[PDB]
Design a protein around this ligand. Structure first.
Ligand SMILES: [Mg+2]
Ligand SMILES: [Mg+2]
Lengths: 48, 49, 97, 231, 157, 94, 227
DNA sequence: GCATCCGTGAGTCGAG
């Protein structure tokens, strides 16, 4: 089976930040740069 | 249960010295260890999500 | 940025608002040109960000950049389970685990 | 002291990119006009994508073809990026045929031409075929809107066909710029600029127009008020 | 906390002024910051409190909407027959509590207006609301504080 | 929170008594097919479906609302059990 | 792939001329906030209304001065003047100057303003000032048609040397609050439900207010027509 | 009264 990413899957970085994807937003909802480039992931600062 | 597969990184006729990469293993990109994706992140709270 | 200036686009009004905010935050040195302050922010690793739902900028500059993230093997597709009724144990006559 | 209909400027490069300026506008209307269009442009603009693939001697997506370097997963990954323009407005579906062999690099050009169908990116790589390596494909491209995953549509022309994830939206990127302008003694007026990048399947301007039409048609939905029976 | 905190600025730096017009002129020249503490007529105040005076919350937040002043600026607003020196943000918080519990007087009593909201103050708020208005209205208050808390935490930067 | 829960906690000397009251009442309503309800048609709890509004199938909701209307009598040793059963059967067949 | 969409049903819930709720469901994904935000901006900023721009009071030099014989200071009266809701019956009329003269032990309400042609005072019971024995109030207020919110320091208009500029609140709309809730039609759970809430001063009704708002937006969509 | 010996305890769901 070919598994895409879905709500409930676990992501983590190498520095010990770990979390579950809680929301998949459509591209238009995503915070973007002035040139129109959207971001893939929104991390919470409170975790740092 | 993860799928372990190798993929060829070279092409017909290519000259290769000793130790050059031929096939890319699982979780490997051009001989470098690949455990995930490089994504563009923004660090801000978002609507309690 | 320099590309953007060459493309014939000056500073956005939203970028002005955000720059006022960052100026109040002591992030950028007051009196500089908008380009200078945007460079000052970008150097601190922060950029101006627009909320996609509104179009209005996030009041502050936000830290944005490429990060390496992995998908761990704990996957919801494996873990989700529910039962109404099902098999029962031999001696205890209780539901199996 | 009432602003009126602003000048509308249009800049274009190819069928790919475009800039659309509206000036002068009342304060804040740069965003009021600019952002909704962006949202509609990025999502609801109809387009084309490959909805299915059949290769001969290939039962499923997980298999490798002899003589072919790329695995079927990668071949379909490459097929995802194929840009297929329909000249006919009435044409809902097209099946592209590819037949190739011998040492060669099979590109998008190698598809057998169909009437009122044009490949906007002929240089797109598909496969690398070795000596004796033989590739035969039938791909199905459809008209659709938004992003419909292969799991959702499950479109198959035949038994061994492989359903493919389809991104229909021709719009690659949308940005909008609000700059300070003035008319007469008025100040702090908005000058709006919509920058649009597409795949060439449809031009930026077409997209902008049908997106506007979408916004208007949605504004239509307020025209028939109705009493709340909650009480 | 981000909406309920007030700005403290260093530009004005405690200058003395005879008449308010002098202060307004001074700020206009860029000599004195909006939120910087100063003494007009011998009693301490800020330029912001003099310059902008709102007849009601709706007007104030309307001004915040048009970019006249921010939620963190100290200003003067008329609320419930009282003349208040406070931020529009705090007026907003107060109106959130009030709308949530559907009692304006009680709400006005529960809140501590002149301090920025945090874990302890909000805890005390939840408890007092429990006691006075009961668990249903307290649950509604909770949901509200959740909503606005998140919504504002987002755009806070 | 359950609507008017504070009033319900006011009505009884112990919260668990409220619980028992509501549960028993709900069982009565289920058994008698809601015919025995003390609620007027306009006071009927409504579930909003695809077609339109309908009667709320949930017995507990009903019982709590009925209880809120003060149209119910709750207490110990009101009437002998079989008598209550037979009478409720008489007025409302099942 | 093949898509079906039903035209949403517009739901209206109104209490008097002061308020209304507006529910539009179902909507396609993301279109909740797509219509929602623009209408909010347009409603608050651009909807035509009337405000008190300038006020002159006899024997009063500036804004923070006090009026002998009256309890409220000048500032408190200016505030009360900000809440005055004035309606122009004639579309031709751009501006009015309302005069008021009173004295003695009387509490001046908005009724006391001398009537003007095609000018309706929506809130005649509104409190302006209270006067004691020996107190006198002579004032003229300048009411202009406009849009949104203009601070006093921004227009700076004076008919007289002693006339005081007032922050002008033109917007008949007091507040706009909108929220998008996930609702479902059949199989799909994400479909958008737009709930809109609008406050007004009574001069223009919320339904009228929203209809004006969607008109302004729609007209702007026609500005993409001719290059 | 005080050293010494023998038996009985030592977190929860999950997968295994
Ligand atoms: Mg003022
Ligand atoms: Mg208090």
């Amino acid at each position: 089976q070919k598994r895409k990413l879905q709500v409930g899957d676990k992501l983590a970085n190498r520095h010990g930040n770990k979390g579950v994807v809680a929301k998949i937003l459509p591209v238009e909802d995503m915070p973007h740069l002035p040139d129109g480039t959207p971001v893939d992931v929104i991390l919470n600062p409170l975790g740092v | 249960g993860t799928a372990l597969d190798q993929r060829p990184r070279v092409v017909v006729g290519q000259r290769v010295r000793k130790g050059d990469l031929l096939a890319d293993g699982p979780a490997s990109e051009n001989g470098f260890l690949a455990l995930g994706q490089n994504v563009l992140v923004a660090i801000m709270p978002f609507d309690g999500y | 940025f320099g590309k953007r200036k060459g493309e014939g686009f000056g500073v956005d009004k939203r970028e002005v608002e955000v720059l006022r905010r960052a100026e109040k935050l002591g992030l950028v040195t007051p009196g500089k040109t908008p380009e200078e302050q945007l460079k000052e922010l970008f150097l601190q690793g922060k950029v101006v960000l627009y909320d996609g739902r509104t179009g209005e900028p996030i009041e502050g500059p936000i830290v944005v950049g490429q990060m390496f993230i992995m998908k761990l093997y704990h996957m919801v597709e494996d873990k989700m389970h529910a039962r109404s009724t099902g098999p029962y144990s031999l001696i205890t006559q209780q539901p199996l685990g | 002291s009432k602003l009126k209909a602003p000048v509308f400027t249009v800049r274009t490069q190819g069928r790919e990119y475009g800039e659309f300026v509206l000036e002068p506008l009342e304060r804040g209307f740069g965003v009021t006009l600019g952002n909704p269009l962006r949202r509609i442009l990025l999502s609801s603009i109809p387009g084309t994508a490959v909805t299915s693939v059949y290769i001969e001697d290939v039962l499923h997506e997980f298999s490798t073809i002899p003589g072919v370097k790329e695995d079927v997963v990668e071949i379909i990954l490459n097929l995802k990026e194929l840009v297929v323009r329909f000249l006919n407005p009435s044409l809902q579906t097209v099946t592209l045929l590819l037949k190739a062999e011998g040492p060669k690099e099979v590109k998008a050009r190698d598809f057998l031409p169909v009437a009122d169908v044009e490949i906007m990116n002929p240089d797109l790589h598909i496969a690398t075929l070795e000596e004796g390596g033989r590739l035969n494909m039938e791909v199905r491209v459809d008209r659709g809107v938004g992003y419909v995953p292969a799991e959702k549509h499950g479109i198959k022309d035949r038994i061994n066909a492989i359903p493919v994830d389809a991104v229909f939206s021709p719009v690659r990127r949308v940005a909008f710029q609000v700059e300070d302008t003035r008319l007469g003694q008025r100040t702090d007026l908005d000058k709006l600029t919509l920058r649009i990048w597409t795949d060439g399947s449809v031009t930026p301007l077409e997209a902008l127009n049908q997106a506007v039409e979408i916004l208007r048609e949605h504004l239509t939905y307020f025209s028939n008020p109705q009493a709340a029976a909650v009480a | 906390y981000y909406i309920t905190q007030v700005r403290k600025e260093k530009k004005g730096a405690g200058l003395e002024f005879a008449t308010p017009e002098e202060a307004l002129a001074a700020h206009e020249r860029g000599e004195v910051a909006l939120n910087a503490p100063i003494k007009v007529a011998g009693r301490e105040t800020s330029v912001g409190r003099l310059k902008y005076v709102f007849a009601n919350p709706d007007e104030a937040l309307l001004a915040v909407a048009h970019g006249i002043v921010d939620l963190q600026d100290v200003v003067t607003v008329r609320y419930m027959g009282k003349r208040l020196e406070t931020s529009p943000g705090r007026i907003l918080f107060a109106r959130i509590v009030a709308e949530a519990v559907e009692d304006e007087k009680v709400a006005w009593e529960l809140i501590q207006l002149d301090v920025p909201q945090e874990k302890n103050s909000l805890k005390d708020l939840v408890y007092q609301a429990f006691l006075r208005l009961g668990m249903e209205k307290t649950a509604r208050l909770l949901d509200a504080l959740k909503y606005y808390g998140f919504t504002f935490s987002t755009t806070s930067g | 929170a359950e609507p008017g829960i504070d009033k319900l906690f006011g009505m009884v000397d112990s919260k668990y008594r409220l619980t028992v009251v509501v549960a028993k009442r709900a069982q009565q309503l289920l058994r008698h097919g809601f015919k025995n309800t003390v609620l007027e048609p306009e006071e009927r709890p409504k579930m909003q479906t695809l077609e339109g509004l309908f009667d709320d199938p949930n017995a507990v909701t009903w019982a709590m609302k009925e209880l809120l209307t003060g149209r119910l009598v709750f207490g110990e040793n009101l009437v002998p059990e079989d008598r209550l059963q037979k009478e409720m059967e008489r007025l409302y067949p099942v």
